[PDB]
């Protein structure tokens, strides 16, 4: 990889383990649901997204 | 002005030890008084041994070491005797040291005990405290020990030979009203000799708004000084150190302005 061994850390890949349903649920951005997207984002931002 | 108003009550006073109590005082002040008892009370002890002849089974440094540890009476002369470093003499003089002479030769059949009684001193006020006597060395027939020593003035910070105390028993809060020490099983611990509890109780109830206020002392003298004089010299020495520090602080403040 090209990386010295003194600056690397242990991390967990969040994509390898979850099943297809869970992966799609927790990694696919949704925009049909207006209420949730309005809760997460600001009014201008959700207007732009939709 | 926030100085304390300490009080003293003396419980026991013999020629060997003094047992007293200090009330209404900081823990730090009492602890520093104990440390001054141990290590900052000047006395007179042998510190310059010159050996002319030594046919004993003990080498010269051993004899010098055992001579240095012999306590010498230092009741009143220690105040009038200056430190050798501060004296104007070249090496040693009567105003800053005491001369001792030992001269023993064994020619009888039985073993001879060179004890502290053989330390002859020119100054009558400074003698070994045992005057059974402290054993310096045993001598077989034909062996002689001839030496001359000089005793300086010093305190315990330099060497343990100048320690006047023989164990300063210091105690405070004999029952854990302050919980400064947490007993895992309080019932197992013996009660302190200054405790004020009945048999059923193991330790006093916790006191959330208490501080160390009463300090029990037991200053046992080796013999160089009377115990009362050890305590008086300790307090005077601590006062003198603080006054010297104040003088230096005043000079520094005036120099910084």
């Amino acid at each position: 990889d090209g990386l010295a061994g003194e600056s690397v850390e242990f991390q967990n890949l969040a994509t390898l383990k979850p099943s297809n349903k869970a992966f799609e649920k927790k990694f696919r951005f949704d925009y049909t649901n207006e209420r949730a997207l309005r809760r997460t984002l600001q009014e201008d931002l959700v207007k732009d997204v939709l | 002005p926030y100085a304390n108003q300490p009080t003293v009550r003396i419980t026991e006073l013999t020629d060997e030890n003094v047992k007293f109590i200090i009330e209404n005082t900081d823990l730090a002040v009492a602890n520093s008084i104990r440390r001054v008892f141990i290590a900052e009370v000047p006395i007179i002890a042998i510190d310059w041994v010159q050996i002319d002849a030594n046919s004993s089974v003990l080498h010269d440094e051993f004899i010098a070491h055992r001579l240095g540890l012999i306590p010498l009476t230092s009741d009143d002369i220690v105040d009038k005797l200056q430190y050798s470093r501060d004296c104007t003499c070249e090496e040693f003089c009567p105003e800053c040291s005491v001369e001792f002479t030992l001269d023993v030769r064994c020619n009888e059949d039985q073993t001879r005990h060179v004890t502290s009684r053989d330390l002859i001193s020119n100054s009558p006020r400074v003698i070994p405290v045992t005057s059974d006597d402290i054993l310096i060395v045993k001598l077989r027939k034909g062996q002689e020990l001839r030496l001359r020593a000089y005793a300086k003035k010093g305190f315990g910070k330099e060497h343990a030979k100048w320690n006047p105390t023989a164990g300063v028993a210091f105690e405070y809060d004999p029952d854990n009203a302050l919980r400064h020490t947490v007993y895992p099983k309080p019932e197992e611990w013996p009660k302190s000799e200054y405790s004020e509890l009945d048999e059923d109780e193991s330790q006093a109830p916790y006191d959330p708004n208490g501080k160390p206020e009463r300090f029990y002392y037991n200053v046992e003298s080796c013999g160089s000084l009377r115990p009362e004089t050890i305590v008086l010299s300790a307090l005077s020495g601590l006062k003198k150190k603080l006054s010297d520090l104040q003088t230096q602080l005043s000079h520094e403040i005036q120099s910084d302005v």
């Binding site: - | 059974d132 054993l135 045993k138 062996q143 343990a160 105390t165």
Partner: protein
């Protein structure tokens, strides 16, 4: 080789108590009572005077 002049721990004088201790032991006193009669209360001094070996007595057997 010889009794120390002072207890190592506290500094109590014990160099003058060896001969008295031996004399007490010769008087059919147990070690504990002999130590108690000599004023050694703290167990440091009792250690000092109980565990001592008088090797100078054997060193004095050789001619000078």
């Amino acid at each position: 080789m010889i009794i120390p002049v002072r207890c190592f721990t506290c500094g109590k004088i014990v160099g003058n108590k060896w001969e008295a201790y031996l004399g007490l032991l010769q008087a059919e006193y147990t070690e504990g009572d002999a130590l108690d009669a000599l004023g050694l209360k703290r167990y440091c001094c009792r250690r000092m005077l109980l565990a001592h070996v008088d090797l100078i007595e054997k060193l004095l057997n050789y001619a000078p």
